[PDB]
Scaffold this active site. Structure first.
Site, PDB file in Angstrom:
ATOM      1  N   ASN A 166      14.342  18.354   4.117  1.00 46.64           N
ATOM      2  CA  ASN A 166      12.893  17.328   4.248  1.00 46.64           C
ATOM      3  C   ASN A 166      12.203  16.796   3.628  1.00 46.64           C
ATOM      4  OD1 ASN A 166      12.468  14.275   5.051  1.00 46.64           O
ATOM      5  ND2 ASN A 166      11.916  15.045   6.829  1.00 46.64           N
TER       6      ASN A 166
ATOM      7  N   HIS B 144      15.296   6.349   5.893  1.00 44.62           N
ATOM      8  CA  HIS B 144      15.335   7.941   5.257  1.00 44.62           C
ATOM      9  C   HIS B 144      16.066   8.951   4.716  1.00 44.62           C
ATOM     10  CE1 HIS B 144      11.646  10.624   4.549  1.00 44.62           C
ATOM     11  NE2 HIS B 144      12.461  12.039   5.238  1.00 44.62           N
TER      12      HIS B 144
ATOM     13  N   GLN C  38       6.244  14.416   0.103  1.00 49.68           N
ATOM     14  CA  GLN C  38       5.999  12.628  -0.544  1.00 49.68           C
ATOM     15  C   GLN C  38       5.647  12.005  -0.509  1.00 49.68           C
ATOM     16  OE1 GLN C  38       9.777  12.029   2.668  1.00 49.68           O
ATOM     17  NE2 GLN C  38       8.720   9.099   2.013  1.00 49.68           N
TER      18      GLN C  38
END
EC number: 3.4.22.2
Length: 212
Positions: free
Chosen positions: A175, A159, A19
């Protein structure tokens, strides 16, 4: 549901993403779940656009955070483009879905797992990758290299990530921090501790798309 689930083994998980500095984890988490459900329903694994959700989810806040449930709603009420058609830029821009031609995929809704309920979360994972949230601010989580992670961490979730499997004592998490973090980008987080929040609040807020 079986003792082990690992959606990577069933061709339902795309490569690990990064990200970047952008707070777009909420979009990455949602996209993981859309790629998974499209593979489960159609047999084809494709990459879809985190950037499209980042730009177009008017309930989220771009790189200042957002809601995986809102992104999944957006994909259910319009659709989503392929990642390559609408690649990730790591910055919020103007919504360009209308300019990128017809949507590549569309779902029919978004369901929520019962929160603070490990088995309910496991049940959804046995059907599909699920969007989950957790506390990632702790250095222990930040510096994770491998193994079954037990913390330390609090239940202050911040998150969004995706659960793509589980085992007898862990839940398997994709993730969005690149392939160099954790176990080639994944973390196995201990389960079965009896903490209703889940380790790192993992049971706080879980959503998955529905596609008939």
């Amino acid at each position: 549901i079986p003792e082990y689930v690992d959606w990577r083994q069933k061709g339902a998980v795309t490569p690990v993403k990064n990200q970047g500095s952008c707070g777009s984890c909420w979009a990455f988490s949602a996209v993981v779940t859309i790629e998974g459900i499209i593979k489960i329903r159609t047999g084809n694994l494709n990459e879809y656009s985190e950037q499209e959700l980042l730009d177009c989810d008017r309930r989220s806040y771009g790189c200042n955070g957002g809601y995986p449930w809102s992104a999944l709603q957006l994909v259910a009420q319009y659709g989503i483009h392929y990642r390559n058609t609408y690649p990730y830029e790591g910055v919020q821009r103007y919504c360009r879905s209308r300019e990128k031609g017809p949507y590549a995929a569309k779902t029919d809704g978004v369901r929520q797992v019962q929160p603070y309920n490990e088995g309910a979360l496991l049940y959804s994972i046995a059907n599909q990758p699920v969007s989950v949230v957790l506390e990632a601010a702790g250095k222990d989580f930040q510096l994770y290299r491998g193994g079954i992670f037990v913390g330390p961490c609090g239940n202050k979730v911040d998150h969004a990530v995706a659960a793509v499997g589980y085992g007898p004592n862990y839940i398997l998490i994709k993730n969005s921090w690149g392939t160099g973090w954790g176990e080639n980008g994944y973390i196995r987080i201990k389960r079965g501790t009896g903490n209703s929040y889940g380790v790192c609040g993992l049971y706080t807020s879980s959503f998955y798309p529905v596609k008939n």
